[PDB]
Curated annotation (Swiss-Prot):
Protein name in UniProt: Integration host factor subunit beta
Family: Belongs to the bacterial histone-like protein family.
Ranges annotated as spanning the membrane: none
Keywords: DNA recombination, DNA-binding, Transcription, Transcription regulation, Translation regulation
Gene: ihfB
Organism expressing this protein natively: Escherichia coli O45:K1 (strain S88 / ExPEC)
Keyword Magnesium among UniProt keywords: no
Subunit structure: Heterodimer of an alpha and a beta chain.
HAMAP family hit by this protein: IHF_beta (MF_00381)
PANTHER family assigned: DNA-BINDING PROTEIN HU, INTEGRATION HOST FACTOR SUBUNIT BETA
GO BP, sorted A to Z: DNA recombination; regulation of DNA-templated transcription; regulation of translation
Length: 94
DNA sequence: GTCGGCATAGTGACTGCATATGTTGTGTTTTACAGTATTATGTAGTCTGTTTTTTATGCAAAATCTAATTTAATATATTGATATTTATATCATTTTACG
């Protein structure tokens, strides 16, 4: 399921909703979630999950191909935490 | 049947009678527009009452929107073996992107 296939299956089910409307809606939601995480704000969707931002202290990296040294500026990285409903439904085991 | 000599055979030139054609002159009959007058025309200049349209509120109907509020959901905080992501960047493959 890609970004396009996602809009396709959502437009097929929603007949009373223009296909073009669903196409833009999906693109605006993803862009809104990507912009929020950029501003430094978290995301919390009850049932789905919750996006966060974890800090990464600056450390002297090392080229994994050769083994040299490379500086690494301190930055933040997105982190998703599956919700309760998401885990239980995605968990096929016990 | 052709070739040789007056007779055929329509068409063209020639001359004057015979008559339609070209002018000149008198005279009747009717067309054709100018100028004032008569009156029902079509729009004009307004008034008036009915029909039409803009206008100023009025209110039951409709449900979102904001604040009070409770609770599942989220975060802190342990502890430590085990599993996943991680720095760089040239090759390789999938998906976006416009014509």
């Amino acid at each position: 399921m890609t970004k396009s296939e996602l809009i396709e299956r959502l437009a097929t089910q929603q007949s009373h909703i223009p296909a073009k409307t669903v196409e833009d809606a999906v693109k605006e939601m993803l862009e809104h979630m990507a912009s929020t995480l950029a501003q430094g704000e978290r995301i919390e969707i009850r049932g789905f999950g919750s996006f966060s931002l974890h800090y990464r202290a600056p450390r002297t990296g090392r080229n994994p191909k050769t083994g040299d040294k490379v500086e690494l500026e301190g930055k933040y990285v997105p982190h998703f935490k599956p919700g309760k409903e998401l885990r239980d439904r995605a968990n096929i085991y016990g």
